[PDB]
Symmetry: C2
Subunit: 383 residues, 2 copies
């Protein structure tokens, strides 16, 4: 009946010398001769609908300007020196809005696809935040772009695990991604292979975090931003070779087929229907069809956004925070998700879907490698 799940805090931290413009990889393309496959990447780059890409540094950064592309190990160092502190910060903010002190946190569910370490990057955030030594941690791998909502769903079950025993649960949900440092890697592949490869044109850096509470022993008033009502997750069969992030001495090589937008669009109607199938009577009749909702969509391609607005019959305004993030920060893989949710609850209320009706019910949506599809139903609290 009542799950008692709520996001009680959200925080985002994009790196500062962000906004690597458009002249960006046009400029770093100074490590390769002119070639017609390269030219095409530069061309497509101009109509991704992205204006600025948030990044841990500028096209001048040392790591990006070695005679060679940085090795996977050189990536790990900058992931730590520049990536982690975004993660620490995003968490402080989230914990501040949730009015929680380090000691109250029970689990941590983190994700990333742009690092590999033992101990994982999560250990280090926890360390600096001073979380308990008795904390329960989960670092998700293998999922890339769908990572935010996966971590959220896993946080949910986990919270509920503690609800079973009667224990308060405050799960820090962490996403950190640093992809822009892999520009040189992607530039070599475009040069050597002569395939176009649109990966460099889309990905960016960010960290974001939410606190998920199971409501047991919650601070008086029990004040949350979103309640978490339900979630649906699924894997599209025989679609491994369409989308992926293969390990490499230079980090990870992007895999993307012509089929991805179609499979991504086609998934929405059945997945949506299953989200609502398991939620009837719980929501009012004014929230039945996709347009009755606000849509926290993970962007990661203009084509994916417009794909949705056609398939589900939405306006761009329904995904107003999705566009806002995409245009001004790029596709920050698993970390864009919460970055959208936090943005949605601000001043976006104006550019909003209909005449001017802010929707009480919000559907989170996302996909990534494997082609996993993730979707969740949220209830925004009207102040």
């Amino acid at each position: 009946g009542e799950l008692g799940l709520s996001i009680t805090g959200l925080g985002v931290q994009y790196p500062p010398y962000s906004l690597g413009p458009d002249a960006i990889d046009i400029l770093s393309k100074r490590y390769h001769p002119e070639s017609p496959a390269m030219k095409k990447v530069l061309a497509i780059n101009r109509y991704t609908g992205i204006d600025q890409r948030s990044s841990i540094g500028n096209p001048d950064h040392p790591l990006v300007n070695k005679p060679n592309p940085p090795t996977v190990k050189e990536l790990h160092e900058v992931f730590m020196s520049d990536g982690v502190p975004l993660a620490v910060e995003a968490s402080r903010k989230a914990m501040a809005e949730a009015r929680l002190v380090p000691a109250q946190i029970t689990h941590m569910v983190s994700t990333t696809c742009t690092d590999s370490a033992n101990p994982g990057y999560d250990h280090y955030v926890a360390k600096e935040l001073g979380l308990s030594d008795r904390l329960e941690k989960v670092l998700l791998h293998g999922i890339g772009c769908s990572g935010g909502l996966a971590a959220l769903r896993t946080a949910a079950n986990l919270c509920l695990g503690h609800t079973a025993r009667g224990k308060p649960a405050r799960i820090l949900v962490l996403a950190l991604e640093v992809s822009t440092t892999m520009v040189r890697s992607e530039l070599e592949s475009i040069d050597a292979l002569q395939e176009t490869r649109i990966g460099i044109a889309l990905f960016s850096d960010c960290a974001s975090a939410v606190i998920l509470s199971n409501g047991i022993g919650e601070a008086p008033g029990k004040p949350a931003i979103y309640d978490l009502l339900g979630w649906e997750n699924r894997v599209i069969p025989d679609s491994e070779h369409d989308l992926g992030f293969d390990v490499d001495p230079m980090g990870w090589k992007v895999v993307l087929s012509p089929r991805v937008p179609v499979l991504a669009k086609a998934s929405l109607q059945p997945t949506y229907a299953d989200l609502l199938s398991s939620l009837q009577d719980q929501l009012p009749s004014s929230y039945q069809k996709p347009a009755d909702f606000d849509w926290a969509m993970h962007p990661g391609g203009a084509t994916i956004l417009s794909g949705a607005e056609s398939a589900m019959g939405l306006t761009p305004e329904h995904m107003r925070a999705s566009y806002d993030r995409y245009i001004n920060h790029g596709n920050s893989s698993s970390a864009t998700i919460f970055s959208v949710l936090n943005r949605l609850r601000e001043k976006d209320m104006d550019a909003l879907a209909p005449g001017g009706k802010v929707k009480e019910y919000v559907v989170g949506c996302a996909f990534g490698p494997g082609i996993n599809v993730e979707m969740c139903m949220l209830k925004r609290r009207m102040n």
Copy 2:
């Protein structure tokens, strides 16, 4: 009070060449001329007390006979090619014992430190097994050796999340590690850097699985192997640099300080006390002191087992299953533990710590990077 969590199946799958003799890495010096630090590792190799060591190949395998060490990309290939069939077989055997049909598996939790992938390797495993499309997967990263027990603990929480919601839960808990393929990477470090580095003398290849059940939708007949009663987990402070696996162009580099065994030893007593105190009211008088239980220790180092014997006041036989796996297979990272538990309930129960006395209660225990400590309490259903 009654968690109703139970291990209803188990399965282990070692590679074909498994038995890798001690001569292996000695003769694998068709690649380096003798050096001081190298002589010292080949010596330590013969002090580990490991008889045989499990490997997906023999010393002549093509991957480890190239002019250079294989790249991390090349490791992945053979991880897919030779590691996955192991995880599939392991999982198949666990489900068979559990008398479970693919469509019944509601969650999957997997671990590995010897691969990175998108989609991650647990996707290919689910496909091969014909698992559901609405399967919720967790691929754990960053935790090396304590992976087995961490995945158990995580599955435990997941099981209860479903319990809180009145749903059945049947979770495939899986550990796959292929470490012998990194022999050339480590061998090069030993030579190039002239430092000891013992990893190459310890690690091995294995896949192990377990089915954790939440009991809902199960008949009260419910035959099981172990009931899961409780769990403690902790991070030892300021010990990140003692255990680890660093990402490298040629895979992952071992970090293994001489401090490691010492810190392990010193965590045993306190963590056991925390475990027992949450469960003492639930246990009989005859299971109260470390020596009263059987001990599913994760080996990797003989010092851990000898350290545990005196730290807690045990005899080697108290952990007879640990020795059997260490001696005959080496240290298979996160895959060893479930193998220790599988072997434990066989006719290993004839080297019982005291007389004809198999113990009804077994404490599982495992150390890993970050210096993570995992301990759990099992109830062996005595037929």
